[PDB]
Design a binder for this molecule. Structure first.
Ligand SMILES: Cn1ccc2c(N)ncnc21
Length: 167
C-alpha cells in the first residue's frame, strides 16, 4: 500500500491523475519525484521551473554545483539529486525536446531511467514545452516503465483526452 490518492489506474503499474506535480509532491512527500530536466539542469519553466520555484531555488543551486562537477547530462539520461522540501530524491530525467530537434526515439531511453526506482511521482516527459505529443509519451511510458509510476498531468483538458484515448 502507498499514500497516492485519487489516481485512475491504467495498467498493472501505471496510474494517472489531473494534478499540479508540485502540490502532489508537497502532499505525498514521495521517495522520488521526477523532474522534466534539460541537459544543463537549467530549471527555467514547465515542470522544472515550477519544481525549482517550490524549492526557493535550492534545486537550481544544487544543480549548478552538479553541472560544474560533472558536465551536462545526455538526452535520454538522468541524475539523482535531492528532493529538497518536495520528496526524498529528485530524479532529473532529460526527455528529447522536439522544439530543439532531438530524436523522439530517445523518449524510450528517458523512461528507462524510471526502472531504477520502485515507485515514482512523475510527469509525462517530452510533453508540455518539450513539444512531443503527450498521447505518445503516455504510450511509451506504459510500454517502457515496469516500476510503479504515478503520473501527474497538469492540464484537465489533456488529462481527459489521455484517459479517453488510452488503449
Ligand atoms: C507537464 N507539466 C508542466 C507543468 C506541470 C506540473 N506543475 N505538473 C505536472 N505536469 C506539468
Amino acid at each position: 500500500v502507498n499514500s497516492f490518492s485519487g489516481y485512475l489506474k491504467l495498467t498493472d503499474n501505471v496510474y494517472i491523475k489531473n494534478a499540479d506535480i508540485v502540490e502532489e509532491a508537497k502532499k505525498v512527500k514521495p521517495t522520488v519525484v521526477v523532474n522534466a530536466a534539460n541537459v544543463y539542469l537549467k530549471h527555467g519553466g514547465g515542470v522544472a521551473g515550477a519544481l525549482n520555484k517550490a524549492t526557493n531555488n535550492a534545486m537550481q543551486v544544487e544543480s549548478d554545483d552538479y553541472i560544474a562537477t560533472n558536465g551536462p547530462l545526455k538526452v535520454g539520461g538522468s541524475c539523482v539529486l535531492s528532493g529538497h522540501n518536495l520528496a526524498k530524491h529528485c530524479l532529473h530525467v532529460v526527455g528529447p525536446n522536439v522544439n530543439k530537434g532531438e530524436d523522439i526515439q530517445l523518449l524510450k531511453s528517458a523512461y528507462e531511467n524510471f526502472n531504477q526506482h520502485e515507485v515514482l511521482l512523475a510527469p509525462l516527459l517530452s510533453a508540455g514545452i518539450f513539444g512531443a505529443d503527450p498521447i505518445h509519451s503516455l504510450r511509451v511510458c506504459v510500454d517502457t516503465v515496469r516500476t510503479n509510476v504515478y503520473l501527474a498531468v497538469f492540464d484537465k483538458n489533456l488529462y481527459d483526452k489521455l484517459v479517453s484515448s488510452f488503449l
